[model samples]
Target: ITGTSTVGVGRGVLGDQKNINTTYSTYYYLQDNTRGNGIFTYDAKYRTTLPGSLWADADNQFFASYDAPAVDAHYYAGVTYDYYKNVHNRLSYDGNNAAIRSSVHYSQGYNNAFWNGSQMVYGDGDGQTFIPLSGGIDVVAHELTHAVTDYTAGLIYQNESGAINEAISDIFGTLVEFYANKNPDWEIGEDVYTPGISGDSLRSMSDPAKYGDPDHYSKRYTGTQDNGGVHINSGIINKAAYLISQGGTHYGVSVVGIGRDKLGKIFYRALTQYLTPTSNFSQLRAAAVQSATDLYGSTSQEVASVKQAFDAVGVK
Candidate 1:
């Protein structure tokens, strides 16, 4: 709905207060026109249907308990946009300023969130496993990064390619979390995962093996489930990314820390410039090595670390 741009105060799922960009038509709606095309959030209303209704509020304030997920979804979408625009110099997920859309409160006790190839969808968790997924910026960024990968690398969502795709999401997700500086850590989905269990997360990028995920290729799951273990095998790449930014030794191979910005630049370059739809782990390693070399000379420490990181994870 076309209307005057407005700002509304709201509290997110974790009960933190923040302001959200809204639009004031007949009612204040979660339609933020501040960023490129727009950032629109909808209400799923506990149903499986898509971007249900544009969230509307009589007043320009969102503080109700039920409003938490929408608040964070809307606000965090903008934050993710900012991270891409400001940090990566990419517009929205498409690098063309595509309108960002999200729907919260999806289904009854829905326990996951996804990009859905069109828009973002967040499920209000069943209270035990999770509260509301949007409460975690890493989760939001991770899903959005899938959109990024779709637009750029177009990595197939199966086997080694799929693991690379998942790892790319985790990489940027953790980077976006650190970019926001919100109690950042290498763990994924910690903020909204396992409300009763403290210090636990859906996955760990710094140490994927901490939660049964293999940190090396030798331990990778070869099962047919999880799309040939996309999530499981991603641990190998995630550990490599962690080792690149925060150096570590795995299987006796050591990598020198190259820091987050370079890690992001190398992977972003690889995704956008080198990778393809059927890119496997070995191809990803070559792409990253080439990307680092392209960005920082062939003999740069960045390139060396990229090689060492992939080697440490036994990708070579």
Candidate 2:
């Protein structure tokens, strides 16, 4: 794939950014599995403190002024680099060599994290409501996929764009989760949250229709809350993608159970390279189907699954 771009590079878009000392670690009982904790682990300062050391005093207090989440953020930016390159064979977030950076452990008790045009921010979590959105490969991949969205479809942040954007994240988010585990079942955000709570998860790939929210695919969107309701609407695409991959099972209206990985490549390629900002469900389904056909032939199993799942979800 193309690895060069005309876009300008940011300071620390990637976690392993150049010489930026903006990150640290924690001894709060949870261990960073990728990088071993303690003496033998990576000691190099891969990240720097937001250009000229901005979030110092406040950050230090949360977890000792160290941008620890940046450590994991940068680490997975690298992990995302490897996964997309090694598996997807794409080069970086933009499909171009344009450098990227990531900022981590942002804002005091920042409950949610997201990507702006240039960089991504991480929240320390309430420490009671949520955990650090770190080291979970899928979380990193999810955020990066949004960057991919920024470059790819440039899908609107509302309506179908919201749904598509959210689903893309959920798609890769689940992939990143399973990529780390290779678990048979596909789920999202099992880590970064207090499991002692009530519901099963933040969202479900297997059954988006039954999640905590009321706005499943067929349900009308209220359009009053939750970042254009991207997170909630994403459940439809997530479930549809899941259904396409997971034996082609229907979960009632606009919901399809999906398999994993094999179908991911198809969706990934389509979302990143094809489609545009105004792309909708029909466009998305067409793109994904076209991708499946190109990758595995018109009559290929994956292509059939893609179409079946799309139709099941009322994509037409």
Candidate 3:
């Protein structure tokens, strides 16, 4: 999509009309040429395949209920891009403004979404379980952050390293959600997780144990399921991140709050510069300690809180 950039008005999965970046030649297409090489969104149309057809609309307005997922997928990708560039001062997932792509409506009754090493793939989800994942800002950011991890830390997708990967996504995903200021909470997928249920999310950062996730290293899952419990064990690191930002007494250990900006600064530095492919939970603790020290000095409260947060989570 190298044509002239255009603006299209569309309602997202949550039924909110917002302007989205698009491209136009013969017809308006969901390709934002203004960002990266280009941010292109596709329509999978219930197919389990690679990039499907480029989402096209006759008028510059996308108001159809069916196009809601594509609308949000495209719009949210741009928002995630802005979060990195505007906040982290990074270009894109690769720090080079690499072209971002997303495919919506991937497979019928699909209940998941992911970054497939190249582009973002989203499922429509079973109506009961989810409406469209793109509707959740944190969900969109979580999936996109995986691309960032892939390009930077390249954390192995199993065991401790994989748990780190998942936590990193959850951390930044929540950050981006708060950044957007849309009923912000430290909950993942709250917007689209369960349509039938209210006041719940797929995961809770403030309290991972609410959903039976391990908030402590001693409680980590040791089974061989779920890529070594990447999602489950991530609660340990998630709790650490939550404590770093908000601060509280947890398990009889107290941490002084350092706020979200510093939390992001510490974790972003660790992920981009210090972490390795095989870094385990212990190594992650060290990396965050170093990262906080690098940003806010070894004796600063930020650094101390980083250590205390990880220590409280039993990572050390």
State every prediction's TM-score relative to the real structure. 0.99, 0.74, 0.99
- Provide the lowest-lDDT 10-residue window in model 3: 1-10
Q: After superposition, which runs of candidate 1 have C-alpha atoms over 4 Å from their true positions?
A: none
lDDT (CA) for every model shown?
Answer: 0.94, 0.60, 0.93
Positional deviation of 214 in candidate 2, in angstroms?
A: 6.4
Per-residue lDDT over 1-316 for candidate 2, one digit per residue giving the tens place of the 0 to 100 score: 1121111111222222222222233221111222211101121132333422222222322233244564566546655666666778777667764455555555666666677676665666777666666545567778878887788778888877777888888788777666656332455665666636745556777776566642235663648576667777777677678777775446453323335777778888788767788887788889998888888899777777787777676667
Q: Per model, how many backbone clashes are there?
A: 0, 31, 0
Q: By TM-score, how accurate is candidate 3? A: 0.99
Using lDDT, rank the candidates from best to worst: 1, 3, 2
In model 2, the Cα lDDT at residue 149 comes to 79
lDDT of 1: 0.94
Q: For residues 1-316, write the lDDT of model 1, one tens digit per residue.
A: 8999999998999999999999998999999999999999999999989989999999989999999999999988888899999988999999999999999999999899998999999999999999999999999999999999999999999999999999999999999999999899999999999999999999999889899999988898888999999999999999999999999887888899999999999999999999999999899999999999999999999999999999998888
The candidate, 2 or 3, that scores higher on lDDT is: 3
Q: How far is candidate 2 from the true structure (C-alpha RMSD, Å)?
A: 9.1
